[PDB]
């Protein structure tokens, strides 16, 4: 019943805004990342990643798209999306909640297993 | 082997003030350390009381330093 609010604005308000003010809506590192340059030199992968995310399955569970890019900052436009990101061995298929904003795909795929020691 | 955790008063009560005014100008060496030891008060409080007694003129200055100061009584003659 609770309605989520990020930085005083609503989810559809976050979708219908642009990067030029969204950099100030982000933190210090994410502003530096988005203000660094064009997503063309290596992030044509990111360009086609948001293209493949903008491909729209019908009104069901959306289709999972998987990628090797662990440096992808969650835009507000891709909330409620199904994605599995590579940790090196397999793909951890994760549901994008409306809380992901301000992080990476590497925040949500663990690499090391949690260790459980036995006998020395 | 008694601990006896000291609890020095931050300001003077009634008995400490006249005890100081009758006994401190009757001692040989006066430093804030020995005033805090004998009168169970704080170090800075002893410094403020000694500055007041210096301004009153009943204590002569010997040497001043950022570590400690040296005070003595008046000549009884």
């Amino acid at each position: 019943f609770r309605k989520f609010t990020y930085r005083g604005v609503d989810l559809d308000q976050l979708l219908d805004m642009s990067y030029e003010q969204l950099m100030q809506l982000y933190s210090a590192r994410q502003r530096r990342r988005l203000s660094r340059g064009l997503r063309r030199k290596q992030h044509s992968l990111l360009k086609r990643l948001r293209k493949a995310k903008k491909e729209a399955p019908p009104m069901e569970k959306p289709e999972v798209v998987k990628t090797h890019l662990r440096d992808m900052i969650i835009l507000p436009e891709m909330v409620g999306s199904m994605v599995g990101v590579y940790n090196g061995k397999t793909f951890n298929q994760v549901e994008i909640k409306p809380e992901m904003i301000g992080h990476y795909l590497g925040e949500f795929s663990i690499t090391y297993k949690p260790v459980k020691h036995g006998r020395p | 082997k008694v601990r006896d955790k000291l609890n020095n008063l931050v300001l003077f009560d009634k008995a400490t003030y006249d005890k100081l005014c009758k006994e401190v100008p009757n001692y040989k060496l006066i430093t804030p350390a020995v005033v805090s030891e004998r009168l169970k008060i704080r170090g800075s409080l002893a410094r403020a009381a000694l500055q007041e007694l210096l301004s009153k003129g009943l204590i002569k200055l010997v040497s001043k330093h950022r570590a400690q100061v040296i005070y003595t009584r008046n000549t009884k003659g």
Partner: protein, 144 residues
């Protein structure tokens, strides 16, 4: 002056915590959880209260003004970079928290991380170090 004044309040009951009155006012208010040494000098500089007095002889109007500076520090011209909690993920406001908002908001942030399932939240749930340091040689007081 140096003689103890009348109604010299020894124990100060401020913001449901215990505050000694024998300490300096620039340092006796630092016993409150959330406020430290650096921000204490700014508060007693905005209010017209000198730093040369102990906390045990101040009275209701000056400590009430200091409590207003505690609760609402923004419109007493305290600069925005001096605060501990800035640019909130819930509402986006600049505020200073004094142990209650501080404790419950730290708890809410930790349960937010544990619910969001970030590896910072998983490391806080497991009880390990989060800032990315070596655990092989240190942290020997973890568990028996």
């Amino acid at each position: 002056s140096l003689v103890i004044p009348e109604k010299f309040q020894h124990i100060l009951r401020v913001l449901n915590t215990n505050i000694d009155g024998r300490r300096k006012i620039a340092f006796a208010i630092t016993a409150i959880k959330g406020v430290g040494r650096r921000y204490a000098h700014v508060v007693l500089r905005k209010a017209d209260i000198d730093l040369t007095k102990r906390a045990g002889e101040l009275t209701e109007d000056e400590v009430e003004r200091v409590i207003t500076i505690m609760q609402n520090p923004r419109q007493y011209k305290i600069p925005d970079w001096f605060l501990n909690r800035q640019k909130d993920v819930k509402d986006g406001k600049y505020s200073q928290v004094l142990a209650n908002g501080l404790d419950n908001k730290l708890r809410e942030d930790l349960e937010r991380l544990k619910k969001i399932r970030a590896h910072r939240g998983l490391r806080h749930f497991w009880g390990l170090r989060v800032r990315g340091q070596h655990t092989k040689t240190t942290g020997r007081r973890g568990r028996t």
